[PDB]
Design an enzyme around this catalytic site. Structure first.
Site, PDB file in Angstrom:
ATOM      1  CD  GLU A 100      -5.825  -8.012  -4.103  1.00 58.70           C
ATOM      2  OE1 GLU A 100      -5.832  -8.828  -2.910  1.00 58.70           O
ATOM      3  OE2 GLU A 100      -5.542  -6.888  -4.125  1.00 58.70           O
ATOM      4  CG  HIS A 135      -6.455 -12.662  -0.265  1.00 58.56           C
ATOM      5  ND1 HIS A 135      -7.089 -12.725  -1.507  1.00 58.56           N
ATOM      6  CD2 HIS A 135      -6.153 -11.586  -0.365  1.00 58.56           C
ATOM      7  CE1 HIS A 135      -7.008 -11.823  -2.120  1.00 58.56           C
ATOM      8  NE2 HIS A 135      -6.358 -10.869  -1.460  1.00 58.56           N
ATOM      9  CD  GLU A 136      -4.947  -9.326   4.479  1.00 54.27           C
ATOM     10  OE1 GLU A 136      -5.887  -9.172   5.617  1.00 54.27           O
ATOM     11  OE2 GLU A 136      -4.398  -8.212   4.364  1.00 54.27           O
TER      12      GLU A 136
HETATM   13  S1  LIG Z   1      -2.542  -8.327   1.775  1.00 54.70           S
HETATM   14  C1  LIG Z   1      -3.515  -7.314   0.847  1.00 54.70           C
HETATM   15  C2  LIG Z   1      -4.818  -7.615   1.381  1.00 54.70           C
HETATM   16  C3  LIG Z   1      -6.084  -7.121   0.143  1.00 54.70           C
HETATM   17  N1  LIG Z   1      -7.290  -6.784   0.640  1.00 54.70           N
HETATM   18  C4  LIG Z   1      -8.635  -7.405  -0.157  1.00 54.70           C
HETATM   19  O1  LIG Z   1      -8.157  -7.399  -1.374  1.00 54.70           O
HETATM   20  C5  LIG Z   1      -9.859  -7.184   0.203  1.00 54.70           C
HETATM   21  C6  LIG Z   1     -10.184  -7.777   1.711  1.00 54.70           C
HETATM   22  C7  LIG Z   1     -10.624  -6.895   2.952  1.00 54.70           C
HETATM   23  C8  LIG Z   1     -10.305  -5.530   2.315  1.00 54.70           C
HETATM   24  O2  LIG Z   1      -9.386  -5.069   2.535  1.00 54.70           O
HETATM   25  N2  LIG Z   1     -11.524  -4.674   2.008  1.00 54.70           N
HETATM   26  O3  LIG Z   1     -12.711  -4.991   1.808  1.00 54.70           O
HETATM   27  C9  LIG Z   1     -11.407  -8.802   1.455  1.00 54.70           C
HETATM   28  C10 LIG Z   1     -12.771  -8.146   1.383  1.00 54.70           C
HETATM   29  C11 LIG Z   1     -13.663  -9.100   0.951  1.00 54.70           C
HETATM   30  C12 LIG Z   1     -13.716 -10.464   0.944  1.00 54.70           C
HETATM   31 CL1  LIG Z   1     -15.096 -11.489   0.606  1.00 54.70          CL
HETATM   32  C13 LIG Z   1     -12.290 -11.160   1.110  1.00 54.70           C
HETATM   33  C14 LIG Z   1     -11.437 -10.184   1.141  1.00 54.70           C
HETATM   34 CL2  LIG Z   1      -9.798 -10.994   1.121  1.00 54.70          CL
END
Ligand SMILES: *SCCCNC(=O)C[C@@H](CC(=O)NO)c1ccc(Cl)cc1Cl
EC number: 3.4.24.69
Length: 423
Positions: A262, A223-224
């Site tokens: 996002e 995802h990141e």
């Molecule tokens: S590169 C930018 C990444 C952004 N992070 C998120 O969107 C949330 C992430 C973890 C976090 O930063 N805070 O909770 C996250 C959280 C929960 C779940 Cl189930 C998946 C994800 Cl990718």
């Protein structure tokens, strides 16, 4: 093939090439951190990120209060050599899991090719690097040599579970929104994972569920990499553009807003919340950015630095942006090839599509509610593998995502903080 050829131990001796103490450029002043170059243009720093932001130098909670219930604080995490050894081994394991799939092999190739643009010059005829897209390696003689890089995997700061992309900015350029790109610092940890509920009505409800299933950290990392992917090609949607969630009455109640960037990174039904009018305004906007990148490569007749040739650098940037090298000596944009690459970075590389490749249970939407966060050790192969993750094959865990079942595979997870109710 492997993505990481060298299996790194944290206590491996420093060589100054891919195992060395380094300095982050615009991090004011800092003492050197031991870093590991696990791939071309990709380094891993097993440290809490007390560097990228001057405002995030401590690991303790601030006067901050009743704003983030989805947070977790432990100032002793990632402080010992043993934790750093497992962190770097955990990142390395998740990188091979991403490399194990065709989708990840394509995203990782797009990431390694995404060299940040040389646009630090102020003469049109000169192609000069942007100085904060590098790092400072200590070489064996004791001195500092600067080296370009695309991606940095860093530990989290005070708030452990708030993973996010970070990148240094220009005084004039918006590097992640102007097609240039910039070196991306991903706050990540492979030692924690979030909980989610299997039923949609429960997962999107802020009052139900304790987090029966856990998120595969390979999905979280991928995802990141998708965000940093867009940010390395300078096509990131401005975080001011957000979508007023009107499909979750709990979201509407609090006025919680979710960014376009996002929603795009998740994909699925979420990426359709962008209505087609502004979806086309973005493509047209970034089409222009690619083209005067082509116009700038046409203006340049000299190259600064001694690392590489002007011919080699121009070939790098018509490989990254897929520009057309005709024989006028001038670079062009093909809208068809631009759309082919723009759709790849945005639609093909999504969190939802990585779920289809990992055969993994996952949150069905980004507009849900986090339920719990667990402590995990994915390093031992008895716990987690490159190809299966938690659902070890030829074992009771392979069926029905039982490896991600925090109650059925209970010894792999230890709940640390509940998010249900605090919302
Ligand atoms: S590169 C930018 C990444 C952004 N992070 C998120 O969107 C949330 C992430 C973890 C976090 O930063 N805070 O909770 C996250 C959280 C929960 C779940 Cl189930 C998946 C994800 Cl990718």
């Amino acid at each position: 093939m492997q993505f990481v050829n060298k299996q790194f131990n944290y206590k491996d001796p420093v060589n100054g090439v891919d195992i060395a103490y380094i300095k982050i450029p615009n991090v004011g002043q800092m003492q050197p951190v031991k870093a590991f170059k696990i791939h071309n243009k990709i380094w891993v720093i097993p440290e809490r990120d007390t560097f990228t932001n001057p405002e995030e130098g401590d690991l303790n909670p601030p006067p901050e209060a009743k704003q983030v219930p989805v947070s977790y604080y432990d100032s002793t995490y990632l402080s010992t050599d043993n934790e750093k050894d497992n962190y770097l081994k955990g990142v390395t394991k998740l990188f091979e899991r991403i490399y194990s799939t065709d989708l990840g092999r394509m995203l990782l190739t797009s990431i390694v090719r995404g060299i940040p643009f040389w646009g630090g010059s102020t003469i049109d005829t000169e192609l000069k690097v942007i100085d904060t897209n590098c790092i400072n390696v200590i070489q064996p003689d004791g001195s500092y040599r600067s080296e370009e890089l695309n991606l940095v995997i860093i530990g989290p700061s005070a708030d452990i579970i708030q993973f996010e992309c970070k990148s240094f900015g220009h005084e004039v350029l918006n590097l992640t929104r102007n097609g240039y790109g910039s070196t991306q610092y991903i706050r990540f940890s492979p030692d924690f994972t979030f909980g989610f509920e299997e039923s949609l009505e429960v997962d999107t409800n802020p009052l139900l569920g304790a987090g029966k299933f856990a998120t595969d950290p390979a999905v979280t990392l991928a995802h990141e990499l998708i965000h940093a992917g867009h940010r390395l090609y300078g096509i990131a949607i401005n975080p001011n553009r957000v979508f007023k969630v009107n499909t979750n009455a709990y979201y509407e109640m609090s006025g919680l807003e979710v960014s376009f960037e996002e929603l795009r990174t998740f994909g699925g039904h979420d990426a359709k919340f962008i209505d087609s009018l502004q979806e086309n305004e973005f493509r047209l906007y970034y089409y222009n950015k690619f083209k005067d990148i082509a116009s700038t490569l046409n203006k340049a007749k000299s190259i600064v630095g001694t690392t590489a040739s002007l011919q080699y650098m121009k070939n790098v940037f018509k490989e990254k942006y897929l520009l057309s090298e005709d024989t006028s000596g001038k670079f062009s944009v093909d809208k068809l090839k631009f759309d082919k690459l723009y759709k790849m970075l945005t639609e093909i590389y999504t969190e939802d599509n990585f779920v289809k490749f990992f055969k993994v249970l996952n949150r069905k939407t980004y507009l849900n509610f986090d339920k719990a966060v667990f402590k995990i050790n994915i390093v031992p192969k008895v716990n987690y593998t490159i190809y299966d993750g938690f659902n070890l094959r030829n074992t009771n865990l392979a069926a029905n995502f039982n490896g991600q079942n925090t109650e059925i595979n209970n010894m792999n997870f230890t709940k640390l903080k509940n998010f249900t109710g605090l919302f």
